[PDB]
Amino acid sequence: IDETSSEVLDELYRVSKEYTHSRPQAQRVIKDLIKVAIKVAVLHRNGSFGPSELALATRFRQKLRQGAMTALSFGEVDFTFEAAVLAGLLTECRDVLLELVEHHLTPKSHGRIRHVFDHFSDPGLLTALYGPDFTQHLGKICDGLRKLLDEGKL
Ligand SMILES: [Cl-]
Structure with missing residues (x-):
């Protein structure tokens, strides 16, 4: 696994564990994330997707980059975090x-x-993430997201 991706994945685990207070819950969500990513990866490798599906994959990547850039924008002191917007973008990705x-x-x-x-x-999680208790986590996620975008891994 890519090191930067692993670093972000680690931080997402930590944010989930701290928000839910549950190691089992955080482990579960990250296990599902990894399973899903690999299953999709295999479909790409095996040439399983049809033309409309390959166009959908392109759209998914565009949406994922939009989510990442918006997460970064909301990290700016200048701009006001809006949980409903980031949540809506993530749901569009879903x-x-x-x-x-x-x-x-x-x-x-x-x-x-x-x-x-x-x-x-979840607006609750995102609000916590952008709140006073998660400053360190947010900074690390943003650092990782910026690096992933810079290196073309999103
Ligand atoms: Cl298709």
């Missing part, structure tokens, strides 16, 4: 991914996608 894998992955895998995106798009 929905594009769900469409992408509708005909390729099992309903169980669709459930894992909903679990991951619904966990992190």
Whole structure:
């Protein structure tokens, strides 16, 4: 696994664990995240996607970059964090991914996608993340996101 991606994944785990107060819950969401990513990766490697699905994958990446850039913008003291906006963007990502894998992955895998995106798009979690107690976590996530965008890994 890519080192920067691992660093961000680590931070997402830590944010989830601290927000929920549950190691088992955080481990579960990150396990599902990893499973989903790899399953989608395999579909890309095996040439399983049709033309409309490949266009959907392109849209998903655009949306994911938009989410990342918006997360970064809200990190600026200048601009006011709006949880509903970031949550809405993450839900747009969820929905594009769900469409992408509708005909390729099992309903169980669709459930894992909903679990991951619904966990992190939770306005409660995001509000905590952008609040006074999560300053260090947010900085590290933003550093990672900026590096991923810079290196073309999103
Ligand atoms: Cl298709």
